[PDB]
């Protein structure tokens, strides 16, 4: 994996050593180049992970996720030079440094072979995200959000720490390979249940799971645009990635100790999507939508079913691409009107003709319209859950009904309708905004042709 | 501010006939029943006592509510009509034209130059029109939403740009 980590690390001096106004260009072009090298790993061998060394390994689970992060890196960079341009050279240089330190930790996390090495970088993503949210966040409540974000995931991660070290002293090794081959049946002793709770709660908090989900509406609403997407597009998936990886030793205790989470998730999706049916703030609307889609993956993972797992990873990446995109949609309109309220800016299709389209198939992809991989993800989970229980469809099917009503609702209120009379500062959309939207839509629909590169190891 | 008794009963008259359109349909039936409505409205002119008039219209509104047509004939270019706000997704406001591009701007030089003429006139008329507004403003804030007209010569009436330069009802 050093063909990716090393250029990413060497890009850190690259930005700092750059000139005054060339930082955006060099960082963008090389990050895009880093993305291209990441695509070299999409080929996964028959039934073996592409084990490179003891330090780093990759399989069909992290292969799509890794290139999603590298592909993301230009997109935050392409979404940041609007509000950041009115700042000193150092602070802009610092901002780029953080995201690159962010992706570097993310790249190391997905490729880590050892659960402890997984663990260290998995919490380490807090440090750059926390400062990004707090420093450049354009709001007042962000100060409370940083505390809410940091403690909430840490409050679950710290009990996780004691779980891994216990496994190391008891079972022996702790890497992703030996655990799978030396997996032993977990008993029903009450101590095993608490270890199950410790080994699981840390991952559910970052998903999030309904109830333990209040840190998204705080963080996402007033996070900076660049930090908003990564936290929405991968950092939620980071909690997801550990769910497949760590549920190799928690069998068969998963069958009995999952009912509270399934009930919390299968009911939370209806409740959280019911949140989305009415939101005064567009960004809050998108953040809660991420809760519902992620709650689908929690159901997907907890069943622990072949079909369920492939649907989980397919939805996991697909949601990240569209959720990041919709956040870019919010940033554009919020930039023109300098506010976040729904009804303030309306009838924007007439004023901006192309953005009417960009927000349109963004909503369709959010709607899991077939064959968009959002559908191939959600539909797989329904089939797996229905096999698990025939009444799952009543709830999870009703989600697609509720998901439709709010998804178009933001399309109806903002894009369609009559133009706002007093608003007159909306200029023609710059080609940067239009291009950035295409950098999200095109890979999504392009990847629809070959879902086998997103269906994960269980494919 | 206050729809007086005469204003309300005329409003009752206008709405009553419009509903009776949907009922009578055919014109010959219309001209008869409208005349009864007219004749039976003329009879209570010497009612004198205003209290009776409220009682005379008390049963009238509910009687209209009794015989109101569930599908009244509402006019297409009106609220509730089929062609209501339909021809609106094309009337982009005037101020959007300022954000045009010079290549686009050079396409229509004469109109753009004349628009600049209207642009300057609004700039010159603003100070006079805002000054005129406050010089005869009523005490304790504006009491009536009606705005003063242009009193002297040359000066344009205050708050005119959006009314005058409103998009046409048939922009296409």
């Amino acid at each position: 994996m050093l063909k990716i980590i090393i250029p990413t690390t060497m890009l850190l001096p690259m930005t700092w050593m750059s000139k005054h106004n060339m930082i955006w260009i060099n960082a963008t072009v090389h990050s895009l180049l880093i993305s291209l090298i990441s695509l070299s790993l999409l080929n996964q061998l028959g039934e073996n992970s592409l084990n490179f060394s003891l330090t780093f390994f990759s399989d069909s689970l992290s292969a799509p996720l890794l290139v999603l992060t590298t592909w993301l890196l230009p997109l935050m960079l392409m979404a940041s030079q609007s509000h950041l341009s009115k700042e000193t050279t150092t602070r802009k240089k610092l901002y780029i440094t953080m995201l690159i330190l962010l992706q570097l930790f993310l790249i190391m996390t997905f490729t880590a072979t050892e659960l402890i090495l997984f663990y260290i970088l998995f919490e380490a993503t807090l440090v750059p995200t926390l400062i990004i949210i707090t420093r450049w966040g354009n709001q007042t409540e962000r100060l409370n959000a940083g505390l809410y974000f940091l403690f909430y995931t840490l409050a679950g991660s710290l009990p996780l720490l004691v779980a891994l070290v216990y496994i190391q002293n008891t079972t022996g090794s702790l890497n992703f390979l030996i655990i799978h081959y030396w997996s032993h049946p977990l008993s029903n002793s009450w101590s095993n249940i608490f270890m199950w709770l410790a080994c699981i709660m840390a991952f559910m908090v970052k998903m999030p799971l309904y109830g333990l989900h209040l840190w998204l509406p705080k963080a996402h609403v007033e996070a900076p645009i660049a930090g908003s997407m990564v936290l929405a597009a991968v950092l939620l998936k980071l909690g997801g990635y550990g769910m497949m990886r760590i549920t190799t030793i928690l069998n068969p205790l998963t069958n009995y100790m999952a009912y509270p989470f399934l009930m919390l998730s299968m009911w939370g999706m209806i409740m959280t999507s019911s949140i989305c049916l009415r939101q005064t703030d567009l960004k809050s609307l998108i953040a809660y939508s991420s809760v519902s889609h992620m709650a689908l993956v929690i159901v997907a993972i907890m069943i622990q079913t072949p079909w369920s797992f492939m649907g989980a990873t397919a939805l996991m990446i697909a949601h990240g691409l569209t959720s990041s995109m919709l956040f870019c949609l919010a940033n554009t309109n919020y930039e023109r009107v300098h506010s976040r309220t729904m009804i303030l800016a309306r009838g924007l299709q007439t004023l901006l003709p192309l953005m009417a389209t960009w927000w349109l198939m963004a909503s369709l992809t959010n709607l899991a319209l077939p064959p968009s991989i959002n559908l191939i993800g959600e539909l797989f989970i329904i089939t797996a859950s229905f096999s698990w229980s025939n009444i799952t469809i009543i709830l999870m099917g009703m989600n697609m009904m509720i998901t439709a009503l709010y998804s178009l609702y933001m399309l109806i209120t903002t894009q369609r309708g009559k133009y706002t009379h007093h608003i007159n500062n909306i200029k023609a959309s710059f080609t940067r905004e239009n291009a950035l939207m295409a950098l999200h839509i095109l890979p999504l629909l392009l990847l629809t042709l070959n879902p086998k590169m997103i269906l994960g190891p269980l494919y | 501010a206050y729809l007086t008794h005469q204003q309300k009963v005329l409003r009752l008259y206008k709405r009553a006939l419009r509903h009776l359109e949907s009922w009578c349909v055919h014109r010959d039936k219309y001209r008869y029943f409208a005349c009864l409505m007219r004749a039976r409205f003329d009879e209570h002119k010497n009612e004198k006592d205003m209290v009776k008039a409220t009682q005379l219209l008390r049963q009238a509104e509910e009687e209209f509510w009794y015989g109101q047509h569930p599908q009244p004939y509402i006019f297409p270019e009106s609220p509730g009509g089929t062609s209501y706000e339909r021809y609106e997704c094309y009337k982009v406001p005037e101020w959007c034209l300022d954000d045009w591009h010079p290549s686009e701007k050079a396409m229509y030089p004469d109109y753009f130059a004349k628009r600049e003429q209207w642009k300057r006139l609004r700039r010159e008329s603003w100070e006079r029109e805002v000054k005129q507004l406050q010089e005869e403003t009523p005490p304790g804030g504006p009491r009536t939403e009606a705005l003063p007209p242009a009193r002297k010569e040359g000066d344009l009436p205050p708050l005119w740009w959006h009314i005058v330069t409103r998009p046409r009802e048939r922009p296409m």
Binding site: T350, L352, P353, A428 | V92, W100, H101, S103, Y108, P171
Partner: peptide, 12 residues
């Protein structure tokens, strides 16, 4: 008779 039509700039 032809007359001017207002349209948001699509050149960008």
């Amino acid at each position: 008779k032809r007359l001017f039509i207002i349209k948001p700039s699509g050149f960008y």
